Structures are given as C-alpha cells and as structure tokens.
Amino acid sequence: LALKTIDWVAFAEIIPQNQKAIASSLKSWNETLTSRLAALPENPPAIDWAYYKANVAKAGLVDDFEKKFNALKVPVPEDKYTAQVDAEEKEDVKSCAEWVSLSKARIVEYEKEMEKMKNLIPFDQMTIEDLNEAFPETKLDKKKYPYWPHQPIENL
Amino acid sequence: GAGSIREAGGAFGKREQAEEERYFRAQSREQLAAL
Amino acid sequence: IDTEKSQQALVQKRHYLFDVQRNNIAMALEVTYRERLYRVYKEVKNRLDYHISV
Amino acid sequence: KQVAGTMKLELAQYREVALLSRGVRLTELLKQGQYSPMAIEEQVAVIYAGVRGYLDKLEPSKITKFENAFLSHVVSQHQALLGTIRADGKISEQSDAKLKEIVTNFLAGF
Amino acid sequence: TLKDITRRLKSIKNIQKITKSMKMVAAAKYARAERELKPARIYGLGSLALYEKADIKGPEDKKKHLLIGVSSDRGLCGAIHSSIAKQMKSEVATLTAAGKEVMLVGIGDKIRGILYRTHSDQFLVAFKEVGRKPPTFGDASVIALELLNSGYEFDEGSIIFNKFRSVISYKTEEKPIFSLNTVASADSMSIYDDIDADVLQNYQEYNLANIIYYSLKESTTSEQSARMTAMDNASKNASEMIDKLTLTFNRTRQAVITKELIEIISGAAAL
C-alpha cells in the first residue's frame, strides 16, 4: 500500500466552484477509509486447529474445513479504475501545460511593456505627440470631435 | 436575612454573580490601564 | 504580472485532485479486501465454535 | 499538571462568568464518550490544543469533531511525540514546540 | 429539604420586596415624566404642524435612508426595547428590498445591544446615558449634531419611538424626517415667502432636534409606566410563589417533626 500524502490546504484552493460538492464528498470518503483501514489488522488472526482438532467430537469436519479454508482463494478486486483516473490527469496536465505556456507569453509581454514605462523620457523633454504613444489614454479623439478643442468643453 | 438571593444559588444568584463580576472585571481591566 | 505568477502556482498544485482519487480508490479496495478476509474467517470459526459449543 | 493548572483556573474563571468562549471550548473539551478511556499523553495533548488558544476559532458544535479527527491524526502520524511524552512526563520546550507545529498544521488542514 | 425551602423562601421574599420598591420608584418617576409631557407635546407637535399643513409627502426615489430607534439603557420595562427593534428590523429589510440603502442610529444602549448582532455595519452611531435622568433638550440637541457631523447624505429619515397613550398601553410609532431637497422641491412650499435654500437648511436642522426631543419625552413617559406595570406583575408573581412555598414549607416542617418523633419512638420501644 504505497499511499501518497496530500496537503489538504493545497487541495482546498485548486477546486472550481461548480464541483465543490464532489471534491468535498471525496474528502468525506477519504478519512472514513483512513480510520476504517487502520481500525483492523491487515490479516485476521488465523484461528488455531489444535484446539479444534482434538476438542471437537466430529471426524473429517475439523480437517476439511481447514482444508477447504486453505483451498479457498478469496478474490481480491482488481483496480480497473486507477488507470482510468490516470487517463484524466495526463490529459489534464496536457490542458494545463499549455496554459502555463500561454501565460509565459502574456508575461514576457508585460515585462517588456513595463520596461517601456520604466524608461519614459523625463517629462520636461516630452512632447504632446510623445505623451500619446506612451499613454494612449491622453490622445484626443480627433474623429469624434473634429473641431477645436477636440474635447467636451466641460472636460476641458 | 439579607443576601438570601446569593445564599440560595438559584437562577437569580448565578446571574447576580455574573453581572457583578463582569462589571468588576471591566472596571479592573480599565483601572489597570490608568496605572 | 504577479497575479499571473500565482496562477502558475495554483495550476502547479493541480495534481492533488488526482492524487486523492488515486489514494481514495487504492485504499477503498484494500478496505473491501481486508473486510472480505473477515467474512471468511469470522464465519468458518463461527461454524467451528458451534460444534464445540453444542 | 502543567496544562491542568491553567485549565482548572480558566474553567473556574468561566464558571464565575457563565474569558467566556475559552471556557465554553474547555467544557466541550471535557465532554467524553462512554467506554472510551484516553491515554494520559493524548489527554494532555488535547487539553494543550484547548488551552493554548488553537480552539477559540472553531464553533463549539464542531469541537468534538475536531478532537476526534485530531486524535486520529496524531495517533496515526506522531507516535514519537507521544512516546516522548510517555517517557519523560514533562512537556519539554522541544515537545512543546513540536506539538505547536502539529496543532497549527492540523488546524490549517481542518 | 427544609433548608432548601427556607433558602428559596428568603430569596423570593427579597425579590418581592425589591420589586415592590422598584415599582413604587418607577411610579414616582412616571408621575413626573408625564407632567412634563404636556408642555413637550405642544412644542413637539407644534413643530410638525407645517409639514402637515404644507403636506410634505417625501420622495420615494432616493436610496440613502436614516432610521432612528429611540430607547433607553435600563431594561425591566417589558416590550419597550423589543417593540422598537421589532419595528426597525421589520422595515430595514423592507427598504433594503427596494434598493434603499438604510443606515441606523441607536439612542439608548438597549436598542443597540439588540440590533448589534444582525445589523451592526448598517449602523451610523449610537448613544448612551438615555434613561437615568429625564431627557432634556440639551440631550436632543447633542444627538442632532452628530446626526449632521456624520457625513451621511441621508435623503429620507424616520424616527421610531413609543407613543404614550395611557398607563396601561402604549404604541410604537414612526415620524417622518424630511431633508432639504424634498422640502425645497415640494410645489406646496411655493406659497411660503422669503424662503431660500439656506433658511430652509436652518429650519430642517432645528426640526431635527425637535422631533428627537418630542420623541425622547414620549418614549420616557411610556417606558416608566411600562416599568411600573412590569414590576407590579413581577412582585405579584413573587407573592404567589411565596404563598405556594410557604404552604410547602409548613408541610415539610410538619413531616420533619413527625419523622423525628417516629425515630425516637422506635428507638425507645425496641429496648
């Protein structure tokens, strides 16, 4: 039994709201197994025969039981689901590997964008045609307002 | 037989203790500030 | 930028959602397997202590 | 003794004013099931987690839940701390620090 | 047990005596606080005759809102502090449902300590010391200042108080409080001469101290009478309990004497 530890505080924040019940119910099933698994030995105490070989007045019954018991192969259920949940993860990581890639693009852009506004000309040397390429917020709307002062007089 | 409400120990004695000692705990933590 | 960094951190922790399902499955079978080993022993002994009780 | 002195005094202080939330937490800590006798090591760990302040954040209706889960976790994972408690008899500064660690991490988990 | 019953008898007798003394004290306080309501009901009601002759209706479109609940510090009144809080939180949700943002103010520690649980952030300011001394205009003038030195651009207001009617019964009531932009815009105020938007501000700021003063007189002569009635009922209940416990005490003392006799007699007759 090669269990994997889990940081529940990390598990708590990486779930979407649309399925919190599932992930919460998965938590419910989780600890219920943990105690129940720990609340009983991996193997029961294999009962004696010597106390039953001699202190039982039946012939054959005390042996064929032990014979049939030993000759009983209780089937352990195969997984048949561990690879199926692993089928989702490898696909999920694939869907998330690309996302952390696209974020890198949207980050190399910003760091390149930020260094621009980090090196803007000292404003004393700046021209109104330079303040527009730096802050596109300040460029007047020469298309909406064709005539002077190219803006609402109230805004002025 | 004064003080009988506290000597009995019913509901009106427990609430007497509560009222009095909460008032005096407030006053005590306030008087520890002025010092 | 820093908010985009954290979004890389959160998705870095993603695998836990699949680690629970693995853990919650793997032991679930062991629980049934273990309990199955009682239903055999707790019964064959029962049919043994009977013939010694009577 | 170290934990129970302060626990007794805090429970008294709560009983005269029935702080007050810490006292409610302590009484709900004292509640126990039938035929469930704890060990002294586990008992002192629980009353520690109760008096040092890590429970004035929960609502009393989940206090017993917290102690059940916390005892399960500690007896499953931290047998060495409880072994040192059972061997020494004192909650040394090493043991106090390790127990602080365990209780804060579990409280985060809860 | 005889000692238990003696303890309980002494306790409830102390309770009954103190409750009767308190009832007589509240009766002495009410007789005064009701004599000083007749000159403060001509003043206060004569301060709102304009808003009824001018028939100011008030605008239902504005969102911000103020709600004054008047009560005292001392309990033992009955449903005095409960009727006010019952009315406030009843219509706080009524105005919040229509988008009207409501922010509360609490006159008296009792009306605050009740609503401090549910609506605590919807709470502009609260006051103390209401109830010990008979409320005076110096108290109503102060409460009006911090209702203006608060930065709350309230567009409509109502003050809830316990209208006194008789020693037996009172009713809860709310009086409307109009701001400037509704009394200056009402087309029924066009007849009023020499009016500009400043002499209305000084008139709306004063009529805030009046409707608070008229409220503090009604809700203190209605609280002392309710305290009188509540202490009367408490003393009466204590008296019936004392009667029942005295019957039980007599039964128990007779049983104890008989039991002691039987013990002594059985010890003497066994020799």
Side-chain angles (χ1 to χ4, degrees), chain A residues 1-67 69-79 81-156, chain B, chain C, chain D, chain E:
Chain A
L1 191 73
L3 299 183
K4 314 274 205 58
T5 178
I6 53 176
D7 305 332
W8 279 100
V9 73
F11 173 86
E13 57 193 8
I14 66 159
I15 317 300
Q17 292 84 320
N18 66 329
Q19 60 164 331
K20 298 298 288 188
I22 294 181
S24 161
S25 67
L26 288 194
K27 180 166 187 181
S28 68
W29 270 12
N30 169 267
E31 57 273 341
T32 50
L33 304 197
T34 61
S35 66
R36 180 184 288 186
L37 185 150
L40 57 88
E42 187 263 355
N43 214 41
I47 197 56
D48 178 17
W49 313 351
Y51 167 69
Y52 299 85
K53 297 285 98 174
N55 292 319
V56 176
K58 265 298 300 177
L61 179 132
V62 287
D63 60 56
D64 66 356
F65 269 58
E66 307 305 327
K67 297 317 288 178
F69 157 76
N70 290 136
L72 171 55
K73 297 288 98 175
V74 51
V76 49
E78 75 269 357
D79 289 329
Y81 302 94
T82 314
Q84 308 300 333
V85 70
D86 188 281
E88 177 84 8
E89 177 158 55
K90 184 252 299 180
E91 295 189 6
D92 174 85
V93 161
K94 204 163 192 304
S95 178
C96 292
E98 66 85 28
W99 194 100
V100 68
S101 86
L102 273 71
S103 70
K104 286 309 291 297
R106 275 148 64 244
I107 280 182
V108 72
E109 181 180 2
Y110 294 174
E111 63 198 67
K112 170 256 296 178
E113 195 277 345
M114 181 199 300
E115 61 192 359
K116 170 162 69 68
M117 291 198 183
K118 265 185 53 57
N119 304 128
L120 279 184
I121 301 93
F123 278 107
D124 302 8
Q125 286 94 18
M126 191 155 290
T127 316
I128 307 189
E129 66 91 18
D130 281 328
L131 198 67
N132 289 158
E133 69 92 14
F135 297 165
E137 274 188 328
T138 75
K139 190 183 291 184
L140 299 103
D141 199 326
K142 297 283 193 52
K143 170 185 54 188
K144 163 75 170 303
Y145 314 103
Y147 314 119
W148 199 76
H150 309 303
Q151 50 176 300
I153 299 285
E154 293 86 5
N155 186 307
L156 188 63
Chain B
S4 302
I5 311 183
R6 189 71 177 279
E7 299 174 350
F12 283 95
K14 274 183 171 163
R15 75 172 262 172
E16 192 270 0
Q17 185 179 4
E19 283 194 354
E20 191 185 359
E21 186 171 358
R22 295 295 292 164
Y23 171 89
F24 272 90
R25 276 187 192 271
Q27 180 167 143
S28 176
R29 63 171 157 188
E30 190 203 20
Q31 271 202 347
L32 275 188
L35 192 68
Chain C
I1 279 176
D2 287 7
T3 188
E4 296 287 329
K5 274 186 170 301
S6 69
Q7 301 315 97
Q8 297 173 167
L10 290 201
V11 161
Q12 170 50 63
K13 298 175 185 177
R14 187 57 181 177
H15 67 114
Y16 275 7
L17 182 56
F18 309 92
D19 199 90
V20 172
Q21 306 163 69
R22 257 192 302 284
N23 272 117
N24 217 5
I25 280 182
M27 66 174 55
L29 267 70
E30 162 82 358
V31 171
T32 65
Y33 171 57
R34 284 178 174 190
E35 288 186 349
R36 272 179 178 182
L37 274 185
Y38 277 16
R39 197 165 301 170
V40 51
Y41 153 80
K42 201 188 69 61
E43 287 301 318
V44 60
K45 171 173 187 175
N46 181 267
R47 288 178 196 262
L48 282 182
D49 57 62
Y50 169 88
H51 292 311
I52 212 169
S53 179
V54 67
Chain D
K1 201 176 315 174
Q2 294 179 45
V3 194
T6 78
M7 186 177 179
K8 181 178 190 292
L9 194 148
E10 274 278 325
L11 272 166
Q13 286 182 345
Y14 166 74
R15 286 189 299 103
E16 291 104 12
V17 309
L19 213 63
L20 190 149
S21 179
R22 180 68 80 77
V24 173
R25 267 56 167 180
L26 279 179
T27 66
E28 265 67 0
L29 200 79
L30 282 174
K31 296 180 186 183
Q32 193 170 343
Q34 200 180 33
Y35 311 138
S36 306
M38 312 181 60
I40 176 59
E41 59 192 4
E42 308 178 10
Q43 278 195 64
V44 69
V46 188
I47 60 173
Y48 178 101
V51 300
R52 296 281 189 262
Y54 323 107
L55 285 191
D56 207 355
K57 53 149 289 191
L58 280 80
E59 265 296 308
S61 297
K62 288 183 296 301
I63 278 181
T64 81
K65 301 291 287 185
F66 161 76
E67 282 105 29
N68 285 315
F70 174 70
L71 271 296
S72 296
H73 163 49
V74 177
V75 309
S76 60
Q77 309 302 320
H78 313 303
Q79 286 292 144
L81 187 148
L82 301 192
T84 54
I85 295 293
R86 186 205 309 115
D88 293 358
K90 314 206 163 191
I91 50 171
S92 183
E93 288 84 3
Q94 277 173 220
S95 311
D96 169 68
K98 203 162 190 176
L99 194 68
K100 164 71 170 293
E101 295 290 329
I102 288 172
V103 60
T104 56
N105 298 130
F106 186 88
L107 191 51
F110 209 84
Chain E
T1 300
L2 207 56
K3 285 188 64 178
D4 284 18
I5 305 183
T6 309
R7 289 167 169 260
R8 202 167 148 81
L9 272 175
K10 292 181 181 292
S11 177
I12 303 183
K13 284 179 178 179
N14 285 7
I15 289 180
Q16 191 260 335
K17 286 198 307 175
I18 302 174
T19 293
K20 151 172 283 304
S21 66
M22 204 192 313
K23 162 195 169 60
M24 292 303 291
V25 164
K29 275 188 178 183
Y30 151 77
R32 191 156 57 91
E34 196 262 329
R35 274 196 285 100
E36 311 189 324
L37 181 77
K38 298 184 290 294
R41 194 183 261 166
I42 304 308
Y43 176 96
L45 272 175
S47 180
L48 321 179
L50 182 135
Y51 297 140
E52 196 275 332
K53 290 177 169 51
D55 191 74
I56 305 304
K57 294 291 184 182
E60 297 296 328
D61 68 320
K62 301 303 292 294
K63 300 294 178 69
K64 321 200 72 179
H65 197 105
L66 188 68
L67 199 52
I68 318 179
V70 177
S71 281
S72 177
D73 295 332
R74 277 192 40 81
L76 304 171
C77 320
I80 287 283
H81 320 277
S82 293
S83 186
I84 298 301
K86 162 186 56 58
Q87 179 60 271
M88 283 183 62
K89 72 182 185 294
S90 288
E91 71 174 347
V92 168
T94 302
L95 302 172
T96 295
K100 293 196 59 185
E101 160 196 7
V102 179
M103 183 151 307
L104 311 180
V105 57
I107 308 180
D109 188 74
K110 268 288 187 175
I111 191 62
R112 182 206 67 172
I114 289 179
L115 292 183
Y116 199 86
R117 168 179 293 100
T118 72
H119 325 300
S120 159
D121 56 357
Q122 315 162 230
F123 218 86
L124 182 65
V125 75
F127 304 84
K128 286 171 64 178
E129 300 275 320
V130 182
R132 291 151 169 77
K133 325 284 293 185
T136 57
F137 207 96
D139 289 328
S141 66
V142 169
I143 301 175
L145 271 177
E146 286 86 8
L147 277 182
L148 308 177
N149 297 3
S150 84
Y152 182 44
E153 298 294 328
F154 77 98
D155 294 328
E156 195 61 89
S158 279
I159 172 168
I160 321 187
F161 66 108
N162 292 285
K163 182 92 162 192
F164 166 78
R165 294 150 56 198
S166 158
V167 190
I168 61 170
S169 175
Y170 64 90
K171 63 164 52 181
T172 188
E173 192 167 11
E174 47 172 354
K175 276 293 179 53
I177 289 184
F178 318 107
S179 166
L180 192 148
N181 298 113
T182 179
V183 68
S185 316
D187 290 331
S188 179
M189 301 282 293
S190 67
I191 50 183
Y192 281 78
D193 186 14
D194 196 77
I195 290 314
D196 42 346
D198 176 60
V199 74
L200 272 177
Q201 195 152 337
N202 302 338
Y203 185 82
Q204 289 296 137
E205 289 173 8
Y206 191 76
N207 265 24
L208 186 68
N210 288 341
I211 211 173
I212 283 179
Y213 173 80
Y214 164 67
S215 166
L216 290 181
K217 307 305 282 195
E218 289 268 331
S219 70
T220 197
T221 198
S222 158
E223 172 195 5
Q224 297 295 335
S225 62
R227 174 171 289 106
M228 200 191 84
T229 292
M231 285 309 107
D232 183 61
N233 289 339
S235 68
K236 287 199 285 188
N237 292 13
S239 72
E240 284 102 14
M241 292 176 61
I242 283 163
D243 302 347
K244 297 295 185 290
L245 278 183
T246 302
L247 287 187
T248 298
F249 173 83
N250 289 332
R251 280 181 285 167
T252 303
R253 68 159 266 275
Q254 293 180 35
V256 160
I257 303 172
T258 312
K259 173 181 184 181
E260 181 198 36
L261 280 172
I262 296 166
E263 284 172 7
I264 298 164
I265 284 304
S266 297
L271 298 175

mmCIF file of all heavy atoms in Angstrom, chain B residues 1-5 7-8 12, chain E residues 7-8 10-11 14-15 18 76:
data_model
loop_
_atom_site.group_PDB
_atom_site.id
_atom_site.type_symbol
_atom_site.label_atom_id
_atom_site.label_comp_id
_atom_site.label_asym_id
_atom_site.label_seq_id
_atom_site.Cartn_x
_atom_site.Cartn_y
_atom_site.Cartn_z
ATOM 1 N N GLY B 1 -32.482 38.639 57.075
ATOM 2 C CA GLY B 1 -31.864 37.676 56.182
ATOM 3 C C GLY B 1 -31.523 38.257 54.826
ATOM 4 O O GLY B 1 -32.054 37.821 53.806
ATOM 5 N N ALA B 2 -30.633 39.246 54.816
ATOM 6 C CA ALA B 2 -30.203 39.867 53.573
ATOM 7 C C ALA B 2 -29.151 39.011 52.883
ATOM 8 O O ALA B 2 -28.481 38.185 53.509
ATOM 9 C CB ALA B 2 -29.648 41.267 53.830
ATOM 10 N N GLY B 3 -29.009 39.221 51.577
ATOM 11 C CA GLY B 3 -28.118 38.397 50.790
ATOM 12 C C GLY B 3 -28.659 37.025 50.482
ATOM 13 O O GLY B 3 -27.911 36.162 50.023
ATOM 14 N N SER B 4 -29.955 36.805 50.708
ATOM 15 C CA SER B 4 -30.527 35.477 50.535
ATOM 16 C C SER B 4 -30.598 35.072 49.070
ATOM 17 O O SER B 4 -30.595 33.875 48.762
ATOM 18 C CB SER B 4 -31.917 35.428 51.162
ATOM 19 O OG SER B 4 -31.864 35.751 52.540
ATOM 20 N N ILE B 5 -30.674 36.042 48.159
ATOM 21 C CA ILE B 5 -30.703 35.716 46.737
ATOM 22 C C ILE B 5 -29.391 35.070 46.315
ATOM 23 O O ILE B 5 -29.363 34.198 45.438
ATOM 24 C CB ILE B 5 -31.011 36.976 45.911
ATOM 25 C CG1 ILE B 5 -32.231 37.697 46.484
ATOM 26 C CG2 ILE B 5 -31.252 36.612 44.460
ATOM 27 C CD1 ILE B 5 -32.660 38.903 45.686
ATOM 28 N N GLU B 7 -27.355 33.519 48.674
ATOM 29 C CA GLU B 7 -27.176 32.331 49.504
ATOM 30 C C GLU B 7 -27.932 31.138 48.937
ATOM 31 O O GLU B 7 -27.506 29.991 49.112
ATOM 32 C CB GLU B 7 -27.624 32.614 50.937
ATOM 33 C CG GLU B 7 -26.841 33.715 51.631
ATOM 34 C CD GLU B 7 -27.405 34.062 52.996
ATOM 35 O OE1 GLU B 7 -28.516 33.590 53.319
ATOM 36 O OE2 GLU B 7 -26.740 34.810 53.744
ATOM 37 N N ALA B 8 -29.057 31.382 48.263
ATOM 38 C CA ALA B 8 -29.835 30.282 47.704
ATOM 39 C C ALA B 8 -29.066 29.575 46.595
ATOM 40 O O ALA B 8 -28.873 28.355 46.636
ATOM 41 C CB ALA B 8 -31.177 30.796 47.186
ATOM 42 N N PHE B 12 -31.381 33.484 40.098
ATOM 43 C CA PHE B 12 -31.134 34.877 40.438
ATOM 44 C C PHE B 12 -29.860 35.081 41.244
ATOM 45 O O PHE B 12 -29.491 36.232 41.501
ATOM 46 C CB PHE B 12 -32.324 35.444 41.212
ATOM 47 C CG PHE B 12 -33.501 35.771 40.349
ATOM 48 C CD1 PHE B 12 -34.529 34.863 40.185
ATOM 49 C CD2 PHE B 12 -33.577 36.987 39.695
ATOM 50 C CE1 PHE B 12 -35.612 35.161 39.389
ATOM 51 C CE2 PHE B 12 -34.659 37.290 38.899
ATOM 52 C CZ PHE B 12 -35.677 36.376 38.745
ATOM 53 N N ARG E 7 -34.119 28.622 52.254
ATOM 54 C CA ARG E 7 -33.312 29.419 51.336
ATOM 55 C C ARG E 7 -34.174 30.044 50.249
ATOM 56 O O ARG E 7 -34.084 31.246 49.976
ATOM 57 C CB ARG E 7 -32.228 28.550 50.697
ATOM 58 C CG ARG E 7 -31.102 28.107 51.605
ATOM 59 C CD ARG E 7 -30.300 27.011 50.914
ATOM 60 N NE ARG E 7 -29.052 26.695 51.601
ATOM 61 C CZ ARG E 7 -27.861 27.154 51.229
ATOM 62 N NH1 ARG E 7 -27.757 27.947 50.175
ATOM 63 N NH2 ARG E 7 -26.775 26.817 51.911
ATOM 64 N N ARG E 8 -35.018 29.231 49.611
ATOM 65 C CA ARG E 8 -35.805 29.730 48.490
ATOM 66 C C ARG E 8 -36.849 30.740 48.950
ATOM 67 O O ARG E 8 -37.108 31.730 48.257
ATOM 68 C CB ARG E 8 -36.461 28.567 47.752
ATOM 69 C CG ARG E 8 -36.844 28.891 46.326
ATOM 70 C CD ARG E 8 -37.189 27.641 45.546
ATOM 71 N NE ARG E 8 -38.213 27.902 44.541
ATOM 72 C CZ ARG E 8 -37.972 28.447 43.354
ATOM 73 N NH1 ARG E 8 -36.736 28.785 43.017
ATOM 74 N NH2 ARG E 8 -38.966 28.650 42.503
ATOM 75 N N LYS E 10 -36.549 32.802 51.565
ATOM 76 C CA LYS E 10 -35.840 34.051 51.822
ATOM 77 C C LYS E 10 -35.479 34.755 50.519
ATOM 78 O O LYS E 10 -35.646 35.977 50.393
ATOM 79 C CB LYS E 10 -34.589 33.776 52.652
ATOM 80 C CG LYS E 10 -34.862 33.330 54.072
ATOM 81 C CD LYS E 10 -33.560 33.107 54.818
ATOM 82 C CE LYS E 10 -33.805 32.627 56.235
ATOM 83 N NZ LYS E 10 -34.428 33.689 57.071
ATOM 84 N N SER E 11 -34.994 33.995 49.535
ATOM 85 C CA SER E 11 -34.631 34.570 48.245
ATOM 86 C C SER E 11 -35.821 35.261 47.590
ATOM 87 O O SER E 11 -35.733 36.428 47.184
ATOM 88 C CB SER E 11 -34.074 33.479 47.333
ATOM 89 O OG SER E 11 -33.765 33.989 46.053
ATOM 90 N N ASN E 14 -36.931 38.447 49.366
ATOM 91 C CA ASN E 14 -36.074 39.568 48.994
ATOM 92 C C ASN E 14 -36.442 40.097 47.613
ATOM 93 O O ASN E 14 -36.539 41.314 47.401
ATOM 94 C CB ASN E 14 -34.608 39.139 49.028
ATOM 95 C CG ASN E 14 -34.073 39.011 50.436
ATOM 96 O OD1 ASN E 14 -34.819 39.116 51.408
ATOM 97 N ND2 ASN E 14 -32.774 38.777 50.553
ATOM 98 N N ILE E 15 -36.649 39.185 46.660
ATOM 99 C CA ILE E 15 -37.017 39.586 45.306
ATOM 100 C C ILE E 15 -38.320 40.375 45.317
ATOM 101 O O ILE E 15 -38.431 41.423 44.674
ATOM 102 C CB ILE E 15 -37.111 38.355 44.388
ATOM 103 C CG1 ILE E 15 -35.719 37.785 44.121
ATOM 104 C CG2 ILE E 15 -37.794 38.710 43.086
ATOM 105 C CD1 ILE E 15 -35.723 36.568 43.235
ATOM 106 N N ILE E 18 -37.811 43.950 46.850
ATOM 107 C CA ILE E 18 -37.089 44.867 45.974
ATOM 108 C C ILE E 18 -37.932 45.220 44.758
ATOM 109 O O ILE E 18 -37.899 46.356 44.275
ATOM 110 C CB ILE E 18 -35.734 44.272 45.563
ATOM 111 C CG1 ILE E 18 -34.904 43.954 46.800
ATOM 112 C CG2 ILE E 18 -34.982 45.254 44.697
ATOM 113 C CD1 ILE E 18 -33.637 43.230 46.482
ATOM 114 N N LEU E 76 -36.053 45.856 32.201
ATOM 115 C CA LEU E 76 -37.148 45.675 33.155
ATOM 116 C C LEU E 76 -38.354 46.537 32.797
ATOM 117 O O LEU E 76 -39.107 46.965 33.674
ATOM 118 C CB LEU E 76 -36.693 45.960 34.588
ATOM 119 C CG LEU E 76 -35.498 45.147 35.087
ATOM 120 C CD1 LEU E 76 -35.015 45.672 36.425
ATOM 121 C CD2 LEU E 76 -35.859 43.676 35.185
#
